[PDB]
Amino acid sequence: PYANQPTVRITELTDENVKFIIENTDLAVANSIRRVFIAEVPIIAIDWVQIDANSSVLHDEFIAHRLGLIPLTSDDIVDKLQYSRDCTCEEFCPECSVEFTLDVRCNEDQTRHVTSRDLISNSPRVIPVTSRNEQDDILIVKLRKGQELRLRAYAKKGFGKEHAKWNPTAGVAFEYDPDNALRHTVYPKPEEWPKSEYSELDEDESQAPYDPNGKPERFYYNVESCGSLRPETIVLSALSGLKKKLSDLQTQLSHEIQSD
């Protein structure tokens, strides 16, 4: 009637992704962790734009949408910043937002690539990922001689439930039972299917013998980071966020039980 005692085994850790395995947990816990990776791990992203001048060939909403999708390093700052809902300030303040400025003008004859390097921030900790000290800079717009783009953005705290720009992942590979032992899939021709990278089967064997007493355990994860957070920071923040969702739910539950 009590909690699982999950174990963890990290099989790869780079700056780009983290590949790990959780054992002795329920499939619902594993999938809620997977969902929180995508939808409830907050990060910083541009969510307010003011175009002072845009002579480029892309209209204002195009530039704004494009700026919103630039990942901003959010590692230690996202926990400190507040949601503008919770901030007791006006529209903005340094406690709930980060100011960016962009001011580019193509005077020279070659096309000027307005890239994420031109997004200048007031906060040194929250900068475009590509601008962080290889991979090139994200391209915001190409400008022709005489074209000019001057804008002022504000980045906010949010998560992927509100908009995919606050999603920190560039793909969450999730898998379990690589050999189809639980038979949660039913291959019409099991020989036709390639083997999982996590499979432990000799090549003559297509799928594992059916396990009637089996349950999903040993979930394999590959959490790729878009750049804002480190992959391990994505996983840790996901676990913390899920735990705070449950804690808030329990607080409200206690108020409802005692009020009855």
């Binding site: 038979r183 039913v186 059916y210």
Partner: protein, 148 residues
Amino acid sequence: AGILFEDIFDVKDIDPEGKKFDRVSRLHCESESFKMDLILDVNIQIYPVDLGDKFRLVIASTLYEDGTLDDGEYNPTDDRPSRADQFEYVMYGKVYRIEGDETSTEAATRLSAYVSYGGLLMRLQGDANNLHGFEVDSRVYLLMKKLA
């Protein structure tokens, strides 16, 4: 006791018409103590059954060792002594037909009780003496155990 029928059967054929369903298999079996034919649908995925196997089949009206009716509701938190403890494969179904060789004037010498365990069908046919416990629209249990 609550047992409508008990005998030892021997699997004489499996899927004469061919495999119709993947996880379900039809066994055509015959006993020795009563000379009763049996067609039975079993989930071979969880309880595989091979040709020539020999098992004890017990059609019961209840699982409780003492005479006590069942409510037809699922109660996993039940600590009473259940006779399902003494068997490996247990199903729960209802009798939906009782045929016989009766005439307009003569009673039936042979009966044929049909049971459905949530769609897995069984036909137990043989002497009418061994099938007086069966009544249509009545809930029963399978209670089947393999023996060597």
